[PDB]
Write a protein that binds this ligand. Structure first.
Ligand SMILES: [Zn+2]
Ligand SMILES: [Zn+2]
Ligand SMILES: [Zn+2]
Ligand SMILES: [Zn+2]
Lengths: 107, 499, 47, 199, 59, 70, 95, 284, 100, 115, 45, 97
């Protein structure tokens, strides 16, 4: 209660595949969709659609940002309960070149 | 001109061959004007635009051709077009949302948001909207979420509330598959206006000679508004600012439900389904509220229309107030509800008033077996709250219904002059623990019928004598004289008065 | 000497198991001493 | 180098079981039964009736909606079964309550009947409108479909009255039409099957 | 003239539908910079100031 | 703005509404029309002994589809 | 307590970010001055609006306001590969 | 190493920096003057020296002395990224009163991050005041002033047994002591009771058990943030906390007419406290 | 699909190898003052979310005093999973433990 | 306990920056009930009881055309003791922009006071 | 009639707008505000 | 007491907001705006070094709203030469005067 629940309890978005908190993003939706939660470094850009007759995309793996790009993949995000200072710690460690991979159990 | 622009919007349609999207936003920015600017597209140039977009649809489904599709859906006041254009614009939406079942995500957002407009304005909204609830079957779901997302506030204007619920009841009669999520949305968002009126209620309103205000009478310029609008609070919520809202919203519900109940739908139609979706909505929403006048009048109106309904509501209401499976204090408010429904509902026969008084004495006839011998054991005088609220639920009947139980032969119905003699003189003294005015009036009218001989036992209370929430369920009558003067006019044929 | 031990851990590619109470307050996990030394499991009656 | 690099990407996107054309009708079979596993949150009001709680919270909001994991429209479910947290079948199972909250999370198995349309398949549905730009359809009286102009055959002309249709032999086409499946669109809250008529 | 000498307000609103500018005092020299450049050229670089200052209605 | 709060309601996917993970545990094995029609006769009967009424109404069209005729 | 959490973190791995942090961030930063006149954040600068919403402007990446943007990472291209001063003693040993 | 990666020497050098998000790099302010952040002054100077070495990168495309400034730029493109991460690993110019802290100085001290904001957080729902004696409360009790008793709240979910008491708390509102400050709806939206009158509270206490229309939140129930009462409990704390008996748990006993936390004499040897002006922290 | 089926099968096998059966369990038969302070915490936290209550609560509004009444009557439907420090565990119902 | 405060407005200008914000009230707008705490010149009547949130002076700025006040930014109820109008020495023609205002927080011996 | 007081010569002084804050008998810059007849209430405690 | 802000959610009304628990700006009718903060920063000239002084007002806790030109500066640059009277511009009306 004292060092989490009453101080900086935030529920963040964590990719289950890369294990990172900072590189997630709520997607700018196509106008007929819902803004979902997507990870950025697991995501591959939609122009990388390089080529059983073909390897076409299942149309729900593609999301956009406010710049206007498109990205395939980057899903498989979940919500965990962290202190917010863990989100600030991970930004101070990236600036040193160090990533923190989080291993999240329901996979 | 009109023959010249037909080769202009076709030349703008040619942005798919070499993929430049040149004249897309130029046409789309002229169609995105309001009605207060005469520089918008007119009735002649729109049919130039619309019929090229309806003769091909492949040469519009680009990511860059998506932009004009917004401004055709956001083409405001489209229900005010001439029938050479109105009956052709509807034909464009019916082919856009069926070629591409993806804009009904965004078109039905408009049709539900335009339910502020009245019935005479939304004759063409629902007749488009009924069409897509059968052609797009997977839209029963997310349109339910639109009707809650776009219901107005408790405290918006009355034109937005009385005409949303008017258009909302229109949607019920042509979509019975939604049904329950129509009434749950109404009755829960009437309690918000409802319960804010009993605590306000002090004085009668002024019967102003004008009852209605007026008939039909008919840019953004946004600045950096981030400062103060201090000390201009005007937070003083009105009397008629919520009494007239509860008039016009809740008269309109009783009008629409009186039309949708009839004996020819109670035989093989869906008029039974209107009743049961209010009965389960009664025992879950309004019955756990506190201090609610003016919404149990909806069930009061509906359970007075036919005789079979009161054979499926009073038996429902007894099963609430006497089952062991119910809560500890739902078995008192419903006894408090049972006494004030029998004593104020008009259109009932004797055979229903008797069967209430049959069981309400037969439960008290069973009461002599076990729960009268625990007086001698050490305990409070409030372990038997279920008994006093049942005896109040029968003495409030005789103060109003005292001429139905007179027979031609000169008897009473299961000893009405004799059974109350034994229950009053017994080892509980219900002349003290119950509400005073419901019990002071039982003895006086029984004194005029020569049953009560117990007016010193009333005086034997100043020295014979969790108490506040036992007073508060007994000073609450669900069917008091209503304050709403417009809605009482509907109930004057249905509501027994004081005399 | 926080970034001194951080240098020794990053070069090690060290998986922190998150079991010490100084490492559970960082990630916000429940401490494993006292009332966090077991699990409470609820017994549901129906199949 | 790249021969075992994109295999962890291509096989992410290849769907598993292809729809067969069956019964010498030419039409494919897109309703399929898949057993899945879930990790759901039983709530304390359903702590006495756990199976009603998993159905009403997690399984009932999942029907007739596109699910990304099974890849289709979930019709219904069959054979819900809560995995016991006690590896001892029996009635008195037990789930694991979270420390912070009074809820319990648990595993479940269930069989989902999903509708799985894929490309190169055959779907026959009623025509509900047809205009001067497309042929609009239903599928199985529930699933919206459309055939646009650039996949209408050239030998077919749109006779105008709303308007009827002319095939290659001068006949109006009925509601029931056979067509071949193009990109199935998903991104709405409405599942759209775009289709073709050419072979 | 108004696109080269004066200032249109920022954003995306007051520049395409209805223009909105303001005569700043820092461009009251620049407009008169080329008004006086033509009048100087009409007399071949001989400027007659005082009859022009009664004509331009200034000091 | 307000639409930043409407998409919290447009998503409305908590850990009470949605499962945390979904994984297919075997391969999808196809069924027959005699098995679909046997299932829908039992799934609709189970739920009809709220929500879900807008869904079942779309299943009865498919129950009318595999055997009957509009 | 009415907003439970499902998935939970159980172990943390330390590592080194490779050269392809560029993949998670196509929002490079070039202009060293952070603002210009009219108080705006200049594009390609350190207060760019693709790093999170800022000064009552929406985020160019999330599309969300200042209350709901998580904030995002950009990267400065070093022209020549300087060494990381944490790991400098641990390359001078291998050197 | 199950992932069978390669140990490569690029991991020791820095190809790119990464800029932290703008929320973690907001400008500073003091009084009425806003200043630029610490993490922009060290991080623009890398980016000007990146520019200045591209200014001099054009001085071989058309083509000594310029390599005495090219090699000078590599030392200071090193000494700027060195001074971005650390600050004791640089040289600087002058006595700039312990110059601008890098991202290691944010982690390694008593203060900084890892000991000031991970082991040592500041908390909500806590009060401190001077302590005063009382032999009339119990030994396992604290005397909470009425100032603290109308501020500290407890989220109490409304059910079928506390509806009689939580309705009375909303009626009293956030001024009369057995009361409440705000309620929480089933969709998590809060409704504050502070500006409301006696009629908007009675007409909102009556809706505490009304089920919402929504089916996603049909499980949940409302939460009334009642004031602290005599059945609540409290962690109490004398500030040099040298052993675990200096932070015990008391039962609340709300007193009138005070502004001081109020303690019994059995406890004053445990906390090593005396009534000379000592303050104690009350956690709820 | 096969990579999950062969993954759940590992997990339910690992958790089967760590379950000490009820006859092999050799920890203390008393409730160890932290189990008591968490059973009463978790049961009172479930009661306030409208869980079915197995005792005649006599006007008690504190959820924690209700759960102290159920612990006195052995009516609490919880199970303590006592972890041993390799990861293996023992399940103890609250009904069979002894309250100090 | 006496306690002073320097209500200054010239903290936010340069040498040639003209006088942006004045004292006193404005016109063509009416935020009422400030005249209970304040006088016609936009300065408080001295001797006036104040609490937190109460207006302490009214300054009419010209970059908003709005009569803004600034509030008593402390939580103990005081009384205005003295209002001093500080003139200007750098020139002889600027309006008043600095006002030093003195409070009087009365302090009876409450329980918890060291003697 | 609203007045102020000079801090030096104690002369009462009405000060209109577009006037320098100075005394008008001496030239003293600091200038203190007088109090007028205005109601305030106290409890005699 | 209130301050002007955006429209409140829950379909409230076009409203103006007010910080109440120093971090939860409610609406006029008591609806707490979901996800609001009221940030600050700590100081216990001196006590460190000064980077620069970029002048913002910062009443929106981070973001600044005032301190910008060309919004009401539009009517400030053209008012001062027309605010003062007695301009001595009077060319032929002075003969009448
Ligand atoms: Zn990822
Ligand atoms: Zn963002
Ligand atoms: Zn003087
Ligand atoms: Zn609101």
């Amino acid at each position: 209660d004292r060092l989490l629940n009453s101080s900086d309890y935030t529920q963040a978005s964590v990719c289950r595949e890369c294990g990172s908190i900072l590189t997630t993003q709520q997607s700018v939706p196509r106008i007929g969709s819902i803004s979902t939660v997507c990870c950025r470094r697991c995501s591959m850009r939609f122009e990388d659609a390089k080529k059983g007759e073909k390897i076409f995309i299942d149309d729900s793996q593609i999301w956009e940002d406010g710049q206007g790009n498109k990205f395939v993949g980057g899903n498989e995000t979940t919500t965990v309960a962290i202190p917010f200072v863990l989100k600030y710690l991970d930004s101070e460690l990236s600036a040193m070149g160090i990533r923190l991979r989080y291993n999240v159990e329901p996979k | 001109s009109a023959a010249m622009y037909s080769r202009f919007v076709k030349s703008a349609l040619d942005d798919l061959d070499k993929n430049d999207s040149t004249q897309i936003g130029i046409i789309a920015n002229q169609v995105a004007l309001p009605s207060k600017n005469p520089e918008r597209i007119n009735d002649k140039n729109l049919n130039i635009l619309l019929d090229i977009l309806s003769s091909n649809i492949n040469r519009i489904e680009s990511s860059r051709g998506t932009f004009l599709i917004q401004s055709i859906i956001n083409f405001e006041k489209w229900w005010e077009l001439p029938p050479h254009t109105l009956s052709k614009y509807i034909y464009f939406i019916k082919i856009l949302c069926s070629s591409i079942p993806k804009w009904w995500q965004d078109v039905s957002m408009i049709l539900v948001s335009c339910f502020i407009l009245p019935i005479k304005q939304t004759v063409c909204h629902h007749d488009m909207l009924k069409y897509f609830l059968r052609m797009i079957p997977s839209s029963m779901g997310f349109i339910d979420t639109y009707l809650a997302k776009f219901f107005p506030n408790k405290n918006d204007t009355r034109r937005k509330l009385v005409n949303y619920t008017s258009n909302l009841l229109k949607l019920r009669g042509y979509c019975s598959e939604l049904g329950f999520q129509i009434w749950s949305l109404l009755i829960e968002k009437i309690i918000s206006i409802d319960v804010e009126l009993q605590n306000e209620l002090d004085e009668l309103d002024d019967d102003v000679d004008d009852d209605d205000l007026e008939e039909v009478d008919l840019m953004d310029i946004i600045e950096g508004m981030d400062g103060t609008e201090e000390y201009n609070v005007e937070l003083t919520q009105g009397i008629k600012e919520l009494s007239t809202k509860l008039d016009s919203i809740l008269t309109l519900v009783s009008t629409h439900v009186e039309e949708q109940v009839t004996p020819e739908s109670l035989e093989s139609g869906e008029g039974v389904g209107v009743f049961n979706t209010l009965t389960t909505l009664f025992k879950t929403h309004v019955l756990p509220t506190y201090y609610t006048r003016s919404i149990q009048y909806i069930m009061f109106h509906v359970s007075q229309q036919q005789l079979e309904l009161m054979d499926s509501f009073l038996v429902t209401l007894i099963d609430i107030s006497f089952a062991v499976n119910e809560a500890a204090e739902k078995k008192i408010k419903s006894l408090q509800y049972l006494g004030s429904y029998i004593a104020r509902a008009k259109k009932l026969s004797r055979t229903q008033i008797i069967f209430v008084a049959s069981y309400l004495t037969s439960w008290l006839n069973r009461y002599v077996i076990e729960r009268e011998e625990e007086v001698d054991q050490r305990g409070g005088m409030e372990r038997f709250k279920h008994f006093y609220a049942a005896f109040q639920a029968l003495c409030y009947i005789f103060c109003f219904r005292h001429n139905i139980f007179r027979d031609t032969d000169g008897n009473w119905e299961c000893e009405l002059d004799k059974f109350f003699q034994r229950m009053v003189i017994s080892k509980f003294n219900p002349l003290k623990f119950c509400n005073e005015n419901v019990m002071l009036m039982f003895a006086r009218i029984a004194q005029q019928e020569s049953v009560a001989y117990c007016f010193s036992i009333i005086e034997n209370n100043n020295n014979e004598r969790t108490r506040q929430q036992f007073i508060d369920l007994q000073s609450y009558f669900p069917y008091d004289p209503l304050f709403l003067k417009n809605y009482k006019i509907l109930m004057k044929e249905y509501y027994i008065e004081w005399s | 000497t926080t970034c001194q031990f951080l240098t020794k851990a990053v070069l090690d590619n060290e998986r922190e198991q998150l079991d010490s109470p100084s490492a559970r307050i960082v990630v916000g996990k429940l401490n494993n001493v006292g009332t966090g030394s077991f699990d409470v499991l609820a017994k549901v009656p129906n199949a | 180098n790249e021969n075992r690099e994109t295999a962890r990407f291509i096989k992410k996107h290849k769907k598993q079981v292809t729809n067969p054309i069956d019964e010498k009708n030419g039409t494919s079979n897109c309703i399929v039964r898949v057993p899945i596993a879930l990790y759901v949150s039983l709530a304390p009001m359903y702590l006495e009736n756990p199976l009603q709680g998993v159905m009403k919270q997690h399984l009932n909001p999942l029907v007739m909606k596109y699910n990304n994991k099974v890849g289709g429209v979930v019709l219904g479910y069959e054979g819900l079964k809560i995995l016991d947290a006690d590896p001892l079948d029996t009635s008195e199972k037990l789930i694991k309550i979270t420390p912070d909250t009074p809820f319990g999370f648990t595993w479940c198995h269930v069989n989902l009947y999903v509708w799985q349309p894929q490309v190169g398949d055959v779907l026959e549905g009623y025509i509900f409108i047809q205009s001067a730009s497309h042929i609009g359809l239903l599928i199985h009286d529930a699933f919206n479909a459309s055939i646009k102009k650039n996949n209408i055959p050239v030998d077919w002309t749109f006779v105008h009255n709303l308007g009827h249709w002319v095939d290659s032999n001068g006949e109006p086409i009925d509601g029931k039409l056979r067509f071949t499946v193009r990109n199935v669109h998903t991104t709405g809250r409405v599942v759209s099957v775009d289709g073709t008529l050419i072979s | 003239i108004l696109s080269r000498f004066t200032v249109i307000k920022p954003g995306q609103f007051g520049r395409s539908k209805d223009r909105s500018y303001f005569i700043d005092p820092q461009n009251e020299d620049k407009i008169l910079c080329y008004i006086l450049a033509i009048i100087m050229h009409l007399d071949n670089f001989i400027v007659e100031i005082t009859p022009l200052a009664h004509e331009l209605n200034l000091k | 703005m307000m639409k930043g709060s409407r998409r919290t309601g447009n998503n409305t996917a908590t850990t009470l509404n949605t499962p945390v993970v979904i994984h297919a545990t075997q391969l999808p094995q196809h069924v027959s029309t005699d098995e679909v029609l046997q299932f829908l006769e039992s799934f609709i009967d189970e739920k009809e002994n709220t929500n879900l009424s807008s869904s079942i109404s779309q299943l009865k069209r498919i129950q009318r589809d595999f055997k009957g005729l509009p | 307590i009415s907003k439970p959490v499902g998935s939970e973190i159980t172990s943390v791995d330390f590592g080194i970010l490779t050269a392809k942090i560029r993949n998670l961030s196509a929002k490079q930063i070039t202009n060293p001055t952070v603002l210009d006149n009219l108080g705006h954040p200049v594009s390609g600068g350190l207060y760019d609006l693709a790093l999170g919403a800022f000064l009552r402007n929406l985020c160019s990446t999330c599309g969300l306001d200042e209350k709901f943007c998580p904030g995002h990472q950009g990267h400065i291209e070093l022209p020549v590969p300087c060494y990381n001063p944490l790991f400098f003693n641990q390359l001078y040993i291998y050197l | 190493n199950l992932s069978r990666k390669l140990v490569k020497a690029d991991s020791f050098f820095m190809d790119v920096l990464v800029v932290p998000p703008t929320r973690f790099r907001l400008p500073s302010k003091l009084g009425e003057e806003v200043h630029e952040n610490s993490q922009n002054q060290l991080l623009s100077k890398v980016l000007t020296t990146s520019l200045l070495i591209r200014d001099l990168n054009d001085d071989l495309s058309k083509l000594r002395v310029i390599f005495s400034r090219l090699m000078n730029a590599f030392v200071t493109i090193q000494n700027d990224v060195n001074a971005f991460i650390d600050s004791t690993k640089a040289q600087g110019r002058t006595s700039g009163k312990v110059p601008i802290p890098g991202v290691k100085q944010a982690l390694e001290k008593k203060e900084g991050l890892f000991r000031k904001h991970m082991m040592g957080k500041r908390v909500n729902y806590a009060a401190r005041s001077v302590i005063s004696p009382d032999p009339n409360i119990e030994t396992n009790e604290i005397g909470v002033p009425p100032v603290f008793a109308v501020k500290l709240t407890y989220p109490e979910p409304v059910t079928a047994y506390n509806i009689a008491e939580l309705r009375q708390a909303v009626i009293n509102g956030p001024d009369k002591w057995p009361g409440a400050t705000q309620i929480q709806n089933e969709d998590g939206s809060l409704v504050s009771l502070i500006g409301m009158s006696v009629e908007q509270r009675k007409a909102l206490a009556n809706q505490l058990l009304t089920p919402s229309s929504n089916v996603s939140t049909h499980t949940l129930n409302k939460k009334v943030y009642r004031h602290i009462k005599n059945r609540d409990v409290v962690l109490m704390n004398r500030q040099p906390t040298l052993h675990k008996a200096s932070m015990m748990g008391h039962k609340v006993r709300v007193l009138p007419n005070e502004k001081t936390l109020r303690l019994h004499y059995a406890n004053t040897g445990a906390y090593n406290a005396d009534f000379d002006g000592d303050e104690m922290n009350m956690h709820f | 699909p096969e990579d999950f089926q062969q993954h759940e099968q590992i997990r339910r096998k690992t958790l089967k190898e760590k379950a000490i059966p009820k006859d092999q369990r050799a920890t203390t038969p008393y409730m160890t003052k932290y189990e008591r302070a968490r059973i009463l915490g978790t049961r009172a936290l479930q009661i306030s979310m409208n869980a079915p209550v197995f005792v005649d609560l006599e006007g008690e509004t504190d959820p924690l005093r209700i759960a102290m009444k159920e612990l006195a009557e052995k009516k609490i439907p919880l199970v303590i999973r006592r972890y041993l420090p390799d990861g293996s565990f023992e399940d103890w119902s609250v009904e069979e433990l002894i309250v100090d | 306990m006496y306690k002073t405060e320097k209500v200054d407005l010239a903290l936010n200008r340069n040498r040639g920056d003209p006088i942006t914000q004045h004292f006193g009230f404005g016109n063509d707008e009416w935020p009422k009930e400030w005249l209970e705490k304040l006088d016609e010149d936009g300065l408080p009547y001295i001797g006036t009881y104040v609490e937190e949130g109460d207006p302490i002076c009214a300054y009419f700025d010209d970059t908003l055309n709005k009569t803004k006040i600034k509030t008593y930014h402390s939580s103990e109820p005081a009384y205005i003791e003295e209002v001093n109008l500080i003139g200007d020495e750098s020139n002889k023609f600027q309006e008043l922009q600095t006002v030093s205002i003195k409070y009087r927080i009365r302090r009876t011996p409450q329980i918890g006071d060291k003697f | 009639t609203l007045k102020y007081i000079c801090a030096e010569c104690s002369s009462k002084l009405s000060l209109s707008r577009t006037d320098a804050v100075r005394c008008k008998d001496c030239g003293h810059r600091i200038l203190l505000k007088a109090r007028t007849k205005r109601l305030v209430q106290f409890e005699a405690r | 007491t209130f301050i002007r802000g955006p429209i409140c959610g829950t379909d409230n009304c076009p409203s103006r907001l007010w910080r109440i628990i120093d971090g939860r700006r409610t609406c006029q009718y008591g609806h707490v705006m979901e996800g609001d903060v009221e940030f600050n920063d700590d100081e216990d000239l001196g006590a460190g070094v000064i980077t620069r002084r970029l002048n913002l007002t910062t009443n929106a806790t981070g973001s600044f709203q005032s301190s910008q030109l060309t919004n009401s500066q539009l009517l400030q640059q053209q008012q001062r030469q027309s605010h003062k009277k007695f301009k001595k511009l009077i060319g032929h009306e002075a003969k009448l005067l």
